[PDB]
Amino acid sequence: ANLWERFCNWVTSTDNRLYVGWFGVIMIPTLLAATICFVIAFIAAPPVDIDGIREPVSGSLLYGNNIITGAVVPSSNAIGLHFYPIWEAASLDEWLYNGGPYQLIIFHFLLGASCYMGRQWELSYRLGMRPWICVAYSAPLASAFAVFLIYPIGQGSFSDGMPLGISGTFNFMIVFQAEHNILMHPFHQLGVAGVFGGALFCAMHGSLVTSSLIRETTETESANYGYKFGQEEETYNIVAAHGYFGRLIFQYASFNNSRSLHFFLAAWPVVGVWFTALGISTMAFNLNGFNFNHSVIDAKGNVINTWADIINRANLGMEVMHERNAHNFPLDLA
Amino acid sequence: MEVNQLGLIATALFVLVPSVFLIILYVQTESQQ
């Protein structure tokens, strides 16, 4: 009946159209800050000296960018890992030139996303559910942490975090391959397996359930109207689906336990994306993909190239050209 | 920027034509029930 207890009750209420919760109390403002700053920087921010070499890169629409090329540009290499809030700048003019908004956006977003994952725990508890949906979302979350926070920490500069834009993303990928040979790293290969397999099993499961829908409708109506929200009976025949799939391959390569199946569906891409987030996060400390450059040589010692050496030729061309003005000494050590 | 000038009409019709189509179908669905 007391003021605080009433507030606590609204915060944690399961009647709010959108659940708030204690994690929401941090999430709502941090995401709003990040979103507003991003929308405005994407449209109107002046160019940013990402690499600290007084060579501003234009990222916003009003400075000659389209949707594909635009980006909020990472903060200056001259700042490195230093905290650069607005109030640390002599002016907004300075803060804009040096990449201030990237830092504001990504810190608020990492906080708000972290709270997003907590909020998934919290509502699950209020509704009497099992709790581990938030564990599934920790795979995408870890991946964002890796490219916005972990990789900058290991390389010493937010200027090497991932730009918030479409082409910026591709720039990050090409530079990453040249320096870490990420294609040749097992954790990236597992990530592709998690993501290709995720797409595969998505299609499989959707096709098998769709294939064994029980006839409930006429040909003139969407079969979707054969299911009513909250009906107790299943809407497909799982034994017919098992009977099809077990014969398509062989019997014991098919699930007939729906719980094991759906757990499988959860586990495969989650685990694969954990590894690929861990791959980024460990190449942050320069433990790179396998190097087989010149591993094969002949009886005399001539190098016999393999596909790995051809990769390396590509990698070199990415190496020698990236940040073409930023390097004064012969090794790009970070 | 020196963009293709028909890009604007391309984009406007690309949005407008199929959207209008969907709206026509939805509204006449609602006046049925």
């Binding site: 159209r17 959108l18 449209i43 629409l61 009003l62 389209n66 949707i67 009513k228 929200f229 909250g230 009906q231 | 920027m1 963009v3 890009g7 604007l8 984009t11 406007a12 949005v15």
Partner: peptide, 30 residues
């Protein structure tokens, strides 16, 4: 004109979000 077009579309998507959430067909049980 291209900036206006890009922002116009983006803004239509945010408005659609509002309607899809607050003005959805409510799910009713059985």
């Amino acid at each position: 004109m291209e900036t206006i077009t890009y922002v116009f579309i983006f803004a239509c998507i945010i408005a659609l979000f509002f309607f899809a959430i607050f003005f959805r067909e409510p799910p009713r049980i059985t």
